[PDB]
Ligand binder design. Structure first.
Ligand SMILES: Nc1cc(C(F)(F)F)c(-c2cc(N3CCOCC3)nc(N3CCOCC3)n2)cn1
Length: 817
C-alpha cells in the first residue's frame, strides 16, 4: 500500500532509526521480534477501556500519609462564568460528584484547570495524584466541566560432541594481538580459549579450530560467544548468541564487525558495529536439615546483594535448594548457585521452578524482583518469574521504575523478551506510561548504537498501537524538540571558551528564535517531562542564554491551556550527558516514595529532565529559584557570610507568617537533600550546584558532573543560621530528628537502592564496578544496629559543623584555578 509506506516513514521519523533496514544484521531476530510483538500489541489494544484510555486517569491505590490526613473538603468548579465551591467527602466517586452537582442546579467530565489531566473513573477523589498534589502544596483544587474526549481519536491502523569454533582471522581498515573466545551465561564465563598471538597487521589470519570442553547438549539458551582482541589489554569486542530465537544452534560463516573500547551493559550486546568502513571485523566458522547448616544458609540468604558467594555457599544453596525455595529473598543467590553449563542441573532448576507455590504467593518485593533482572541472569525462565511479580504493580508504581526497567532491557539476551512485552503492554494500557516509554526509548535509540536496533523494534511496536491521537501528538513534540535543539547548537558554536557571554549573541538568539516563532513550531506542544503541561507561544522577551560554563538556552513559553498566566520554563543544554541526570533524578523520586510509605514528606524537588540525544536534552525550570552561590555573591568574592542566607528569606518573604513557613520548608528540604545525596554518594557539591526557591525550598542540580568525574553533604553555617545555631536550636533539633527518621526509612529499603544503584552505574555511567558500587553499602551501614547507625549519621552532621566553610572555600578555589 502506498499509504503503508508513508506510515512507515512517519514511524521512522518518530523513532530515529529505520527498523525495516537490514544492513547490520546477520540473522532475522529483529524482524522476527518485530512480528512477535504484533500479537501482544493488538491484544492490549483490544483489552483497553476506550473511555478511560482517552482520559488517562492518574490515580493511586496506596494509603494516605499521616501528615496529609490533616472530613469533607472544598473544590472549585467552572463553566465559563460559573465557579461555585463545593464541600466534598474524601471517599466520593467523581461520578457521584456530578450527581451531587445536579442537586445544586449527562456526559460532561470534570477536568483539571491548567493542564490536560482528568478526574474520572470509579475511584475516590482522595486517591488522585493531582488532588494529593494540591493538598500537599496547599492549593485550591480548581476543576472545569469539560466534555470527555472522543475515543475515536485513538483509533488504530490495521549433538553430544564438544563445541568448537573456527577463528579464521581479523581485519581492520588501518604490537602483538590474540583472539579470545568466551562462552558466557549471566556474565559468568563457562569456558575460555585463546589463539596464539600474532603480530599486528591489517589482516591477521589464524584458521584455527578452537575446541572447548563444553558439550553441545550442555549449551544453555542465552549463552553468548564473547570474542575479544588483546594488546596486554582489551581493544575490540563483539558477541554472538550461540543459540537463537528459534532455539536453533548457530551454524555457518559469520563476519562480525566489532566494537572499540575507551578505557557496562554495552558489552553484553548481541548487536554488531554499524560503521563497517572503520570498525575492526572478525571472520569465524560455525559447524555443530540440621540446625547448624540451616543457620548457615539463613545467614547467606540474609546478606546484601553485593555480597559474593563462595563455592561453599553456592554448593550449600544448591544442595538444600528446596529449603532455599521457601525463601523469596534467596532466589537471586540460589539462581547464581546454578551450574548453567550443565543440561542435567538446569533441568533440575526447572523442575524446581515448577514448585513456585511460595514465590507466587509472596508479597511483591521490587528490590528482589529487579535483582533477578540485572546482568547476573541470562536464563529466560528465571527472568520470567521476575516479570511475573511485576505484573501486580499498579500504573502508579510502574511509572516509578519505568526508566530502570527500560534500561534493564539491555540485560536481556534476546530482543523479544518477557520484560519487553511487559513494557509494551503497560505503555499501551496507560497514556502517561506510554508517553515516558516513548522518550526513554527514544533517548537510547538516538545515542546508543549498541541497543538502538533492539529498542527501535520495541518503540515501533508501541507506536503501532498507541492510537493516532498520541501518534500525531508525539510528532508535533519531536518536531519542536529538533527545532529548538538546532537553535541550541548554533548558539553554542558562537559561545567561545570565554567566561563571559557575548552582548551581540543575545540579539542574535532572539533573531534566530523570531524566525521559528513565525512559522515552524506548532501552536501548541505537550511538554515531554510533564505531559500535563501544554505549552504554546514563546515569551521571546524572556528567552536568554545563561552565564553558565556550558551556557545553555533559557526558554519560556506561555500556557496553551485557556483554563490556566505563569510561563512554562525549559532549559536546553548541550555538552552534558543528561542520561546520567535522568537516572539520579528518578531515584530521587523513588526516595520520596520510601519516605511517603513511612509517612514523611521531605520537600525534595526532582526537577523534570529528559535526554533527547547525544549529550543534548532539556530541563524543567523551577520558578523563582536561585543559586546559593549567587546569594553569597550578592552581599559579598569569596568570604562567605552566615547572615546572608536568612537575610534572603526575609527579603523574599513579606509576611512574617510566610517567613516561618519558608524556614519550615527549608528544614525539610535541606535534611532530605542531605540524606539522599549522602547515600547516592554525591554529597560533596559546590554552592553553585545547590539552589533555593523564594518559598524556602533547597534543591541540588547538575548530577552528571559529580559522579561523572571532603564532606558527607553540603551543610554549611549559613543553613545553620536559619535553624538558629552559631549550639542546638529548637529547629536544629527538628532537623536531626528528621534526618534520622529519613535515613532509617531509607535503610529499610536497602537491597532496593543497592541494585538500582549498581544498575545505574551499569546502564548509564565508564566506572570500576567492584569498587564504585560498594560505597552505597558503607553509606547505609549494612548490618549495623539501628541505634548504632543513628549516631553514625548524626556523626556526619557534626563533620559539617567541624568543616563549616572549609569545603566550599576550596571548591571556590578549584572552580577558579
Ligand atoms: N546537567 C545540568 C545542566 C544545567 C545547566 F542548565 F546549567 F546546563 C542545570 C541547571 C543549571 C541552572 N543554572 C541556573 C543558576 O545558575 C547556575 C546554572 N539552573 C538549572 N535549573 C533547573 C532546575 O530549576 C532551576 C533552574 N539547571 C542542571 N543540570
Amino acid at each position: 500500500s502506498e499509504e503503508s509506506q508513508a506510515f512507515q516513514r512517519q514511524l521512522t521519523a518518530l523513532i530515529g532509526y529505520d527498523v525495516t533496514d537490514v544492513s547490520n544484521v546477520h540473522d532475522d531476530e529483529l524482524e522476527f521480534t518485530r512480528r512477535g510483538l504484533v500479537t501482544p500489541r493488538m491484544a492490549e489494544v483490544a483489552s483497553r477501556d476506550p473511555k478511560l484510555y482517552a482520559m488517562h486517569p492518574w490515580v493511586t491505590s496506596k494509603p494516605l500519609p499521616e501528615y496529609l490526613w490533616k472530613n469533607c473538603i472544598f473544590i472549585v468548579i467552572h463553566r465559563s462564568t460559573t465557579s461555585q465551591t463545593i464541600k466534598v467527602s474524601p471517599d466520593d466517586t467523581p461520578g457521584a460528584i456530578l450527581q451531587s452537582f445536579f442537586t445544586k442546579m449527562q456526559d460532561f467530565v470534570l477536568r483539571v484547570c491548567g493542564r490536560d489531566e482528568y478526574l474520572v473513573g470509579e475511584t475516590p477523589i482522595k486517591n488522585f495524584q493531582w488532588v494529593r498534589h494540591c493538598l500537599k502544596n496547599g492549593e485550591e483544587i480548581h476543576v472545569v466541566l469539560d466534555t470527555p474526549p472522543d475515543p475515536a481519536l485513538d483509533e488504530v491502523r490495521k549433538c553430544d560432541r564438544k563445541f568448537r569454533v573456527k577463528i579464521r582471522g581479523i581485519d581492520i581498515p588501518v604490537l602483538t594481538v590474540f583472539v579470545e573466545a568466551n562462552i558466557q551465561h549471566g556474565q559468568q564465563v563457562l569456558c575460555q580459549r585463546r589463539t596464539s598471538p600474532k603480530p599486528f597487521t591489517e589482516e591477521v589470519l589464524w584458521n584455527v579450530w578452537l575446541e572447548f570442553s563444553i558439550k553441545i547438549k550442555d549449551l544453555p539458551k542465552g549463552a553468548l560467544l564473547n570474542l575479544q582482541i588483546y594488546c596486554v589489554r582489551l581493544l575490540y569486542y563483539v558477541n554472538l548468541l550461540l543459540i537463537d530465537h528459534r532455539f536453533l544452534l548457530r551454524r555457518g560463516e559469520y563476519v562480525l564487525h566489532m566494537w572499540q573500547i575507551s578505557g557496562n551493559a554495552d558489552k553484553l550486546t548481541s548487536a554488531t558495529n554499524p560503521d563497517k568502513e572503520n570498525s575492526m571485523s572478525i571472520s569465524i566458522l560455525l559447524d555443530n536439615m540440621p540446625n547448624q547448616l540451616r543457620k548457615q544458609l539463613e545467614a547467606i540468604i540474609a546478606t546484601d546483594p553485593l555480597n559474593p558467594l563462595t563455592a561453599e555457599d553456592k554448593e550449600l544453596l544448591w544442595h538444600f535448594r528446596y529449603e532455599s525455595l521457601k525463601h523469596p529473598k534467596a532466589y537471586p543467590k540460589l539462581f547464581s548457585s546454578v551450574k548453567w553449563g550443565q543440561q542435567e542441573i538446569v533441568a533440575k532448576t526447572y523442575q524446581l521452578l515448577a514448585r513456585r507455590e511460595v514465590w507466587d504467593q509472596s508479597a511483591l518485593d521490587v528490590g528482589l524482583t529487579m535483582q533477578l533482572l540485572d546482568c547476573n541472569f541470562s536464563d529466560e525462565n528465571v527472568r520470567a518469574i521476575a516479570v511475573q511479580k511485576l505484573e501486580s504493580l499498579e500504573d502508579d508504581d510502574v511509572l516509578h521504575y519505568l526508566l530502570q526497567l527500560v534500561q534493564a532491557v539491555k540485560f536481556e539476551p534476546y530482543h523479544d523478551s518477557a520484560l519487553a512485552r511487559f513494557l509494551l503492554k503497560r505503555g499501551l494500557r496507560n497514556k502517561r506510561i506510554g508517553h515516558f516509554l516513548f522518550w526513554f526509548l527514544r533517548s537510547e535509540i538516538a545515542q546508543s548504537r549498541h541497543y538502538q536496533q533492539r529498542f527501535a523494534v520495541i518503540l515501533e511496536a508501541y507506536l503501532r498501537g498507541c492510537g493516532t491521537a498520541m501518534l500525531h501528538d508525539f510528532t508535533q513534540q519531536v518536531q519542536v524538540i529538533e527545532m529548538l535543539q538546532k537553535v541550541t547548537l548554533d548558539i553554542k558554536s558562537l559561545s567561545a571558551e570565554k567566561y563571559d557571554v557575548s552582548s551581540q549573541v543575545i540579539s542574535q538568539l532572539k533573531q534566530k528564535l523570531e524566525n521559528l516563532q513565525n512559522s515552524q513550531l506548532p501552536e501548541s506542544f505537550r511538554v515531554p517531562y510533564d505531559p500535563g503541561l501544554k505549552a504554546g507561544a514563546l515569551a521571546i522577551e524572556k528567552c536568554k542564554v545563561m552565564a553558565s560554563k556550558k551556557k545553555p538556552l533559557w526558554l519560556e513559553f506561555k500556557c496553551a491551556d485557556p483554563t490556566a498566566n505563569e510561563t512554562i520554563g525549559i532549559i536546553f543544554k548541550h555538552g552534558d550527558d543528561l542520561r546520567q541526570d535522568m537516572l539520579i533524578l528518578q531515584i530521587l523520586r523513588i526516595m520520596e516514595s520510601i519516605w511517603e510509605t513511612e509517612s514523611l514528606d521531605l520537600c525534595l524537588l526532582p526537577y523534570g529532565c529528559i535526554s533527547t540525544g547525544d549529550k543534548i536534552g532539556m530541563i524543567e525550570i523551577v520558578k523563582d529559584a536561585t543559586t546559593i552561590a549567587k546569594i553569597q555573591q550578592s552581599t559579598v568574592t569569596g568570604a562567605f557570610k552566615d547572615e546572608v542566607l536568612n537575610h534572603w528569606l526575609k527579603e523574599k518573604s513579606p509576611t512574617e507568617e510566610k517567613f516561618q513557613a519558608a524556614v519550615e520548608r527549608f528544614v525539610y528540604s535541606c535534611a532530605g537533600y542531605c540524606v539522599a545525596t549522602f547515600v547516592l554518594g554525591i554529597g560533596d557539591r559546590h554552592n553553585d550546584n545547590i539552589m533555593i526557591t523564594e518559598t524556602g525550598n533547597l534543591f541540588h542540580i547538575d548530577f552528571g558532573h559529580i559522579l561523572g568525574n571532603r564532606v558527607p553533604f553540603v551543610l554549611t553555617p549559613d543553613f545553620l543560621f536559619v535553624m538558629g545555631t552559631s549550639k542546638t536550636s529548637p529547629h536544629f533539633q527538628k532537623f536531626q530528628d528528621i534526618c534520622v527518621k529519613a535515613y532509617l526509612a531509607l535503610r529499610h529499603h536497602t537491597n532496593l537502592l543497592i541494585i538500582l544503584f549498581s544498575m545505574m552505574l551499569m546502564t548509564g555511567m565508564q566506572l570500576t564496578s567492584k569498587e564504585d558500587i560498594e560505597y552505597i553499602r558503607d553509606a547505609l551501614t549494612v548490618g549495623k544496629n539501628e541505634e548504632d547507625a543513628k549516631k553514625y549519621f548524626l556523626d556526619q552532621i557534626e563533620v559539617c559543623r567541624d568543616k563549616g566553610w572549609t569545603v566550599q572555600f576550596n571548591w571556590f578555589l578549584h572552580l577558579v584555578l
